[PDB]
Design a protein around this ligand. Sequence first.
Ligand SMILES: Nc1nc2c(ncn2[C@@H]2O[C@H](COP(=O)(O)OP(=O)(O)O)[C@@H](O)[C@H]2O)c(=O)[nH]1
Lengths: 306, 88
Amino acid sequence: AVIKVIGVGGGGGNAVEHMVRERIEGVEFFAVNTDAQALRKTAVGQTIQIGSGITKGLGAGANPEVGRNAADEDRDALRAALEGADMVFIAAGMGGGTGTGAAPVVAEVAKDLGILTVAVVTKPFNFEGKKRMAFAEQGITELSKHVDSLITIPNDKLLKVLGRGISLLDAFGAANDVLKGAVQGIAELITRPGLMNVDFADVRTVMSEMGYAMMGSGVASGEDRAEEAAEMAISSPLLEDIDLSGARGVLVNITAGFDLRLDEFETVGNTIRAFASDNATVVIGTSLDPDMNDELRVTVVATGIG
Amino acid sequence: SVPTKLEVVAATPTSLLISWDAPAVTVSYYRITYGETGGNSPVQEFTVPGSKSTATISGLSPGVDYTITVYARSAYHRRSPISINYRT
Ligand SMILES: Nc1nc2c(ncn2[C@@H]2O[C@H](COP(=O)(O)OP(=O)(O)O)[C@@H](O)[C@H]2O)c(=O)[nH]1
Protein backbone atom coordinates (compact mmCIF):
# COMPACT_ATOMS: atom_id res chain seq x y z
CA ALA A 1 0.00 0.00 0.00
CA VAL A 2 1.18 3.47 -0.98
CA ILE A 3 0.36 6.09 1.67
CA LYS A 4 0.85 9.77 0.85
CA VAL A 5 0.69 12.52 3.46
CA ILE A 6 0.15 16.09 2.26
CA GLY A 7 0.43 19.18 4.46
CA VAL A 8 -1.39 21.96 2.63
CA GLY A 9 -0.82 25.45 3.99
CA GLY A 10 1.33 27.23 6.52
CA GLY A 11 0.04 25.33 9.53
CA GLY A 12 -0.24 22.06 7.62
CA GLY A 13 3.30 22.55 6.30
CA ASN A 14 5.13 22.82 9.64
CA ALA A 15 3.03 19.89 10.90
CA VAL A 16 4.23 17.46 8.22
CA GLU A 17 7.87 18.56 8.50
CA HIS A 18 7.50 17.77 12.19
CA MET A 19 6.44 14.37 10.81
CA VAL A 20 9.43 14.27 8.45
CA ARG A 21 11.94 15.26 11.14
CA GLU A 22 10.39 12.96 13.77
CA ARG A 23 9.79 10.54 10.85
CA ILE A 24 6.65 8.50 10.15
CA GLU A 25 7.40 5.00 9.06
CA GLY A 26 6.83 3.72 5.53
CA VAL A 27 5.04 6.90 4.36
CA GLU A 28 5.77 9.59 1.73
CA PHE A 29 5.51 13.26 2.72
CA PHE A 30 4.49 16.20 0.50
CA ALA A 31 4.53 19.95 1.10
CA VAL A 32 1.87 22.06 -0.63
CA ASN A 33 1.82 25.87 -0.49
CA THR A 34 1.36 29.15 -2.38
CA ASP A 35 4.14 30.95 -0.47
CA ALA A 36 7.31 29.75 -2.22
CA GLN A 37 9.52 30.82 0.69
CA ALA A 38 8.09 28.13 2.98
CA LEU A 39 8.81 25.42 0.42
CA ARG A 40 12.50 26.40 0.23
CA LYS A 41 12.59 26.65 4.04
CA THR A 42 10.85 23.41 5.05
CA ALA A 43 12.80 20.16 4.83
CA VAL A 44 10.29 17.64 3.45
CA GLY A 45 11.70 16.47 0.12
CA GLN A 46 8.73 16.96 -2.20
CA THR A 47 7.36 20.48 -2.16
CA ILE A 48 4.38 21.41 -4.35
CA GLN A 49 3.97 25.10 -5.27
CA ILE A 50 0.42 25.91 -6.32
CA GLY A 51 -0.95 29.12 -7.83
CA SER A 52 2.40 30.41 -9.21
CA GLY A 53 0.49 32.96 -11.31
CA ILE A 54 -2.68 34.11 -9.51
CA THR A 55 -0.49 34.51 -6.41
CA LYS A 56 2.98 35.20 -7.89
CA GLY A 57 4.23 32.77 -5.24
CA LEU A 58 3.60 35.29 -2.45
CA GLY A 59 1.19 33.42 -0.20
CA ALA A 60 -2.60 33.56 0.03
CA GLY A 61 -2.87 36.73 2.16
CA ALA A 62 -4.65 34.59 4.80
CA ASN A 63 -7.45 34.62 2.18
CA PRO A 64 -9.19 31.28 1.51
CA GLU A 65 -10.68 32.33 -1.83
CA VAL A 66 -7.30 32.53 -3.52
CA GLY A 67 -6.40 29.30 -1.72
CA ARG A 68 -9.01 27.38 -3.72
CA ASN A 69 -7.98 29.23 -6.89
CA ALA A 70 -4.23 28.61 -6.61
CA ALA A 71 -5.04 24.87 -6.54
CA ASP A 72 -8.01 24.99 -8.94
CA GLU A 73 -5.08 25.91 -11.21
CA ASP A 74 -2.75 22.93 -10.73
CA ARG A 75 -5.16 20.00 -10.22
CA ASP A 76 -2.97 18.16 -12.72
CA ALA A 77 0.17 19.02 -10.72
CA LEU A 78 -1.60 17.71 -7.62
CA ARG A 79 -2.81 14.66 -9.56
CA ALA A 80 0.76 14.14 -10.81
CA ALA A 81 2.18 13.64 -7.31
CA LEU A 82 -1.05 11.96 -6.17
CA GLU A 83 -1.49 9.28 -8.85
CA GLY A 84 -0.86 5.80 -7.47
CA ALA A 85 -1.52 6.30 -3.77
CA ASP A 86 -4.00 4.05 -2.04
CA MET A 87 -4.59 6.35 0.94
CA VAL A 88 -3.88 10.09 1.29
CA PHE A 89 -3.76 12.06 4.54
CA ILE A 90 -4.28 15.79 4.04
CA ALA A 91 -3.05 17.81 7.04
CA ALA A 92 -3.97 21.48 7.45
CA GLY A 93 -4.48 24.01 10.16
CA MET A 94 -7.86 25.42 9.19
CA GLY A 95 -8.50 29.17 9.16
CA GLY A 96 -5.76 30.58 6.95
CA GLY A 97 -5.90 31.04 3.20
CA THR A 98 -3.72 28.46 1.46
CA GLY A 99 -4.73 25.52 3.61
CA THR A 100 -8.39 26.43 4.02
CA GLY A 101 -9.77 26.49 0.49
CA ALA A 102 -7.12 24.46 -1.31
CA ALA A 103 -7.25 21.45 1.04
CA PRO A 104 -10.79 20.64 -0.22
CA VAL A 105 -9.39 20.84 -3.76
CA VAL A 106 -6.55 18.46 -2.99
CA ALA A 107 -9.11 16.24 -1.27
CA GLU A 108 -11.14 15.98 -4.46
CA VAL A 109 -8.48 15.32 -7.12
CA ALA A 110 -7.39 12.57 -4.73
CA LYS A 111 -10.93 11.35 -4.07
CA ASP A 112 -11.62 11.61 -7.81
CA LEU A 113 -8.68 9.28 -8.49
CA GLY A 114 -10.41 6.96 -6.03
CA ILE A 115 -7.75 7.37 -3.35
CA LEU A 116 -8.95 6.73 0.18
CA THR A 117 -8.94 10.37 1.38
CA VAL A 118 -8.64 11.18 5.09
CA ALA A 119 -8.43 14.83 6.12
CA VAL A 120 -6.84 15.65 9.47
CA VAL A 121 -7.35 19.31 10.43
CA THR A 122 -7.21 21.69 13.40
CA LYS A 123 -9.87 24.19 14.42
CA PRO A 124 -7.99 27.39 15.41
CA PHE A 125 -7.69 28.52 19.02
CA ASN A 126 -10.23 30.83 20.63
CA PHE A 127 -7.48 33.45 20.99
CA GLU A 128 -6.98 33.54 17.19
CA GLY A 129 -10.01 35.42 15.88
CA LYS A 130 -13.71 35.03 15.23
CA LYS A 131 -12.80 35.26 11.53
CA ARG A 132 -10.21 32.45 11.62
CA MET A 133 -12.69 30.40 13.67
CA ALA A 134 -15.29 31.13 10.97
CA PHE A 135 -12.86 30.74 8.07
CA ALA A 136 -12.11 27.35 9.62
CA GLU A 137 -15.73 26.23 10.02
CA GLN A 138 -16.56 27.08 6.39
CA GLY A 139 -13.52 25.31 4.98
CA ILE A 140 -14.38 22.25 7.06
CA THR A 141 -17.85 21.92 5.49
CA GLU A 142 -16.63 22.13 1.89
CA LEU A 143 -13.76 19.83 2.77
CA SER A 144 -16.53 17.66 4.25
CA LYS A 145 -17.81 17.14 0.66
CA HIS A 146 -14.69 15.58 -0.89
CA VAL A 147 -13.27 13.25 1.76
CA ASP A 148 -14.07 9.76 2.97
CA SER A 149 -13.24 10.65 6.57
CA LEU A 150 -12.62 14.01 8.23
CA ILE A 151 -10.86 14.19 11.59
CA THR A 152 -11.29 17.57 13.28
CA ILE A 153 -9.21 18.37 16.33
CA PRO A 154 -10.35 21.59 17.97
CA ASN A 155 -7.05 23.18 19.10
CA ASP A 156 -8.95 24.73 22.00
CA LYS A 157 -9.29 21.23 23.46
CA LEU A 158 -5.49 21.27 24.03
CA LEU A 159 -5.74 24.02 26.67
CA LYS A 160 -7.03 21.27 28.97
CA VAL A 161 -3.67 19.46 28.50
CA LEU A 162 -1.40 22.52 28.30
CA GLY A 163 0.19 23.94 31.40
CA ARG A 164 0.08 27.59 32.19
CA GLY A 165 3.18 29.61 31.59
CA ILE A 166 2.78 28.15 28.11
CA SER A 167 4.26 29.99 25.12
CA LEU A 168 2.20 30.17 21.94
CA LEU A 169 5.16 28.54 20.19
CA ASP A 170 4.54 25.58 22.51
CA ALA A 171 0.76 25.79 22.01
CA PHE A 172 1.22 25.15 18.28
CA GLY A 173 3.84 22.45 18.66
CA ALA A 174 1.27 20.61 20.75
CA ALA A 175 -1.16 20.86 17.84
CA ASN A 176 1.64 19.83 15.47
CA ASP A 177 1.99 16.64 17.53
CA VAL A 178 -1.70 15.72 17.49
CA LEU A 179 -1.98 16.07 13.71
CA LYS A 180 0.97 13.67 13.57
CA GLY A 181 -0.50 11.19 16.03
CA ALA A 182 -3.69 11.06 14.03
CA VAL A 183 -1.83 10.01 10.88
CA GLN A 184 0.74 7.79 12.58
CA GLY A 185 -2.00 6.20 14.70
CA ILE A 186 -3.71 4.97 11.50
CA ALA A 187 -0.83 4.53 9.03
CA GLU A 188 1.20 2.29 11.38
CA LEU A 189 -1.61 -0.27 11.28
CA ILE A 190 -0.83 -0.67 7.58
CA THR A 191 2.93 -0.06 7.67
CA ARG A 192 3.93 -1.61 11.04
CA PRO A 193 1.42 -4.49 11.34
CA GLY A 194 1.25 -6.79 14.35
CA LEU A 195 -0.18 -10.25 14.80
CA MET A 196 -3.79 -9.00 14.89
CA ASN A 197 -3.26 -6.97 11.74
CA VAL A 198 -5.68 -4.70 9.91
CA ASP A 199 -5.50 -4.89 6.11
CA PHE A 200 -5.82 -1.73 4.06
CA ALA A 201 -9.16 -3.16 2.96
CA ASP A 202 -10.33 -3.13 6.55
CA VAL A 203 -9.31 0.50 7.04
CA ARG A 204 -11.13 1.44 3.82
CA THR A 205 -14.24 -0.47 4.81
CA VAL A 206 -14.30 1.54 8.09
CA MET A 207 -13.24 4.98 6.79
CA SER A 208 -14.66 5.13 3.25
CA GLU A 209 -17.46 7.70 2.76
CA MET A 210 -18.02 8.10 6.49
CA GLY A 211 -17.84 11.85 6.89
CA TYR A 212 -16.91 13.19 10.28
CA ALA A 213 -14.62 11.33 12.70
CA MET A 214 -12.74 11.98 15.94
CA MET A 215 -9.80 10.25 17.64
CA GLY A 216 -8.42 9.60 21.10
CA SER A 217 -5.24 8.06 22.43
CA GLY A 218 -3.88 6.70 25.69
CA VAL A 219 -0.67 5.24 27.07
CA ALA A 220 -0.14 3.20 30.25
CA SER A 221 2.41 0.92 31.84
CA GLY A 222 2.64 -2.02 34.19
CA GLU A 223 0.19 -4.68 35.31
CA ASP A 224 -2.87 -2.70 34.17
CA ARG A 225 -1.49 -1.08 31.03
CA ALA A 226 -4.27 -2.33 28.73
CA GLU A 227 -7.18 -1.25 30.91
CA GLU A 228 -5.64 2.11 31.86
CA ALA A 229 -4.72 3.01 28.27
CA ALA A 230 -8.10 2.08 26.73
CA GLU A 231 -9.81 4.19 29.40
CA MET A 232 -7.41 7.07 28.80
CA ALA A 233 -8.38 6.73 25.12
CA ILE A 234 -12.15 6.55 25.68
CA SER A 235 -12.13 9.57 28.00
CA SER A 236 -9.72 11.67 25.94
CA PRO A 237 -10.71 15.35 25.56
CA LEU A 238 -10.30 15.00 21.79
CA LEU A 239 -13.19 12.49 21.87
CA GLU A 240 -15.32 13.92 24.67
CA ASP A 241 -17.62 15.92 22.35
CA ILE A 242 -18.73 12.72 20.56
CA ASP A 243 -20.82 9.83 21.86
CA LEU A 244 -18.89 6.67 20.98
CA SER A 245 -22.05 4.54 21.32
CA GLY A 246 -23.32 6.31 18.19
CA ALA A 247 -20.60 5.99 15.53
CA ARG A 248 -21.07 3.73 12.54
CA GLY A 249 -17.46 2.57 12.95
CA VAL A 250 -14.72 2.38 15.57
CA LEU A 251 -11.13 1.71 14.50
CA VAL A 252 -8.72 0.74 17.27
CA ASN A 253 -4.91 0.50 17.18
CA ILE A 254 -3.05 -1.26 19.97
CA THR A 255 0.62 -0.33 19.57
CA ALA A 256 2.64 -2.74 21.68
CA GLY A 257 5.83 -4.76 21.75
CA PHE A 258 6.27 -8.52 21.65
CA ASP A 259 5.07 -8.95 25.25
CA LEU A 260 1.44 -8.03 24.51
CA ARG A 261 -0.62 -10.58 26.45
CA LEU A 262 -3.49 -12.47 24.83
CA ASP A 263 -5.80 -11.41 27.71
CA GLU A 264 -4.75 -7.78 27.27
CA PHE A 265 -5.85 -7.77 23.61
CA GLU A 266 -9.04 -9.35 24.91
CA THR A 267 -9.38 -6.56 27.52
CA VAL A 268 -8.96 -3.62 25.13
CA GLY A 269 -11.32 -5.38 22.75
CA ASN A 270 -14.04 -6.04 25.28
CA THR A 271 -13.91 -2.54 26.76
CA ILE A 272 -14.18 -0.90 23.34
CA ARG A 273 -17.12 -3.13 22.37
CA ALA A 274 -18.80 -2.15 25.69
CA PHE A 275 -18.99 1.51 24.67
CA ALA A 276 -19.70 0.94 20.97
CA SER A 277 -23.07 0.31 19.34
CA ASP A 278 -23.88 -3.34 18.63
CA ASN A 279 -24.23 -2.37 14.93
CA ALA A 280 -20.99 -0.41 14.44
CA THR A 281 -18.18 -1.94 12.41
CA VAL A 282 -15.49 -2.49 15.03
CA VAL A 283 -11.97 -3.11 13.82
CA ILE A 284 -9.47 -3.86 16.58
CA GLY A 285 -5.87 -4.66 15.67
CA THR A 286 -2.25 -4.29 16.69
CA SER A 287 0.82 -2.52 15.44
CA LEU A 288 4.22 -3.64 16.62
CA ASP A 289 6.97 -1.59 18.24
CA PRO A 290 9.81 -3.85 19.46
CA ASP A 291 11.15 -0.91 21.52
CA MET A 292 8.09 -1.06 23.75
CA ASN A 293 8.35 -3.11 26.94
CA ASP A 294 5.67 -3.30 29.66
CA GLU A 295 3.98 -0.24 28.20
CA LEU A 296 1.11 0.01 25.73
CA ARG A 297 -0.67 2.53 23.48
CA VAL A 298 -4.33 2.46 22.48
CA THR A 299 -5.62 4.69 19.70
CA VAL A 300 -9.32 4.93 18.89
CA VAL A 301 -10.94 6.49 15.80
CA ALA A 302 -14.70 6.95 15.92
CA THR A 303 -15.85 7.38 12.30
CA GLY A 304 -19.17 8.59 10.88
CA ILE A 305 -20.22 10.24 14.11
CA GLY A 306 -23.24 12.20 12.84
CA SER B 1 12.45 16.40 22.27
CA VAL B 2 10.66 15.85 25.63
CA PRO B 3 11.96 16.45 28.27
CA THR B 4 14.13 19.33 26.97
CA LYS B 5 16.57 19.43 29.93
CA LEU B 6 18.01 16.59 32.04
CA GLU B 7 20.92 17.46 34.37
CA VAL B 8 22.44 15.83 37.47
CA VAL B 9 21.62 18.12 40.37
CA ALA B 10 22.95 16.06 43.33
CA ALA B 11 25.43 13.21 43.49
CA THR B 12 26.99 10.63 45.84
CA PRO B 13 29.68 8.05 44.87
CA THR B 14 27.04 5.36 44.25
CA SER B 15 23.87 7.27 43.24
CA LEU B 16 22.68 10.23 41.18
CA LEU B 17 19.54 12.33 41.16
CA ILE B 18 18.66 13.88 37.80
CA SER B 19 16.20 16.74 37.36
CA TRP B 20 14.40 17.42 34.08
CA ASP B 21 12.26 20.38 33.06
CA ALA B 22 8.52 20.60 33.23
CA PRO B 23 6.50 19.64 30.13
CA ALA B 24 4.44 22.02 28.07
CA VAL B 25 1.91 19.12 27.86
CA THR B 26 0.65 16.51 30.32
CA VAL B 27 2.90 13.48 30.70
CA SER B 28 1.37 10.28 31.97
CA TYR B 29 4.64 8.88 33.32
CA TYR B 30 8.35 8.97 32.56
CA ARG B 31 10.33 5.97 31.36
CA ILE B 32 13.82 6.19 32.89
CA THR B 33 16.43 4.05 31.15
CA TYR B 34 19.94 3.17 32.27
CA GLY B 35 22.01 0.11 31.40
CA GLU B 36 25.60 -0.70 30.43
CA THR B 37 27.03 1.36 27.54
CA GLY B 38 27.24 -1.41 24.95
CA GLY B 39 27.23 -4.23 27.50
CA ASN B 40 23.91 -5.86 26.58
CA SER B 41 22.61 -5.63 30.14
CA PRO B 42 18.80 -5.98 30.41
CA VAL B 43 18.93 -2.17 30.99
CA GLN B 44 15.94 -2.69 33.40
CA GLU B 45 14.87 0.97 33.42
CA PHE B 46 12.03 2.12 35.70
CA THR B 47 9.02 4.46 35.68
CA VAL B 48 8.07 7.54 37.71
CA PRO B 49 4.69 9.36 37.89
CA GLY B 50 4.01 12.11 35.35
CA SER B 51 3.87 14.67 38.15
CA LYS B 52 7.61 14.21 38.97
CA SER B 53 10.58 16.21 37.67
CA THR B 54 13.43 14.37 39.44
CA ALA B 55 14.35 10.72 39.95
CA THR B 56 16.74 8.85 42.24
CA ILE B 57 18.94 6.27 40.51
CA SER B 58 20.49 4.16 43.22
CA GLY B 59 23.03 1.41 43.74
CA LEU B 60 25.51 2.68 41.15
CA SER B 61 29.19 1.94 40.91
CA PRO B 62 31.59 4.94 41.20
CA GLY B 63 32.77 3.56 37.86
CA VAL B 64 31.11 2.15 34.71
CA ASP B 65 29.05 4.55 32.58
CA TYR B 66 25.41 4.00 31.68
CA THR B 67 22.74 5.16 29.23
CA ILE B 68 20.78 7.87 31.07
CA THR B 69 17.68 8.65 29.00
CA VAL B 70 14.23 9.94 30.08
CA TYR B 71 11.21 8.99 27.95
CA ALA B 72 8.05 11.10 28.25
CA ARG B 73 4.93 8.97 27.74
CA SER B 74 2.04 11.30 26.93
CA ALA B 75 -1.35 10.54 25.38
CA TYR B 76 -0.92 13.62 23.17
CA HIS B 77 2.45 13.09 21.48
CA ARG B 78 5.20 10.55 20.88
CA ARG B 79 8.19 12.91 21.05
CA SER B 80 11.75 11.66 21.29
CA PRO B 81 13.65 11.46 24.59
CA ILE B 82 16.60 13.24 26.20
CA SER B 83 19.80 11.58 27.30
CA ILE B 84 23.19 11.62 28.96
CA ASN B 85 26.06 9.26 29.78
CA TYR B 86 27.60 9.14 33.24
CA ARG B 87 30.47 7.21 34.87
CA THR B 88 30.14 9.10 38.22
N1 LIG C 1 -0.34 22.66 13.77
C1 LIG C 1 -0.07 23.93 13.44
N2 LIG C 1 -1.11 24.76 13.20
C2 LIG C 1 -0.89 26.06 12.87
C3 LIG C 1 0.47 26.57 12.77
N3 LIG C 1 0.39 27.88 12.43
C4 LIG C 1 -0.94 28.17 12.32
N4 LIG C 1 -1.69 27.08 12.60
C5 LIG C 1 -3.14 26.97 12.57
O1 LIG C 1 -3.50 27.06 11.18
C6 LIG C 1 -4.43 28.12 10.95
C7 LIG C 1 -4.18 28.75 9.57
O2 LIG C 1 -2.83 29.19 9.43
P1 LIG C 1 -1.93 29.01 8.10
O3 LIG C 1 -1.69 27.54 7.78
O4 LIG C 1 -0.63 29.77 8.24
O5 LIG C 1 -2.76 29.69 6.91
P2 LIG C 1 -2.57 29.19 5.39
O6 LIG C 1 -1.11 29.06 5.02
O7 LIG C 1 -3.20 30.20 4.48
O8 LIG C 1 -3.32 27.89 5.29
C8 LIG C 1 -4.29 29.04 12.18
O9 LIG C 1 -5.52 29.68 12.53
C9 LIG C 1 -3.80 28.11 13.30
O10 LIG C 1 -4.85 27.52 14.08
C10 LIG C 1 1.54 25.59 13.04
O11 LIG C 1 2.74 25.94 12.98
N5 LIG C 1 1.20 24.33 13.36
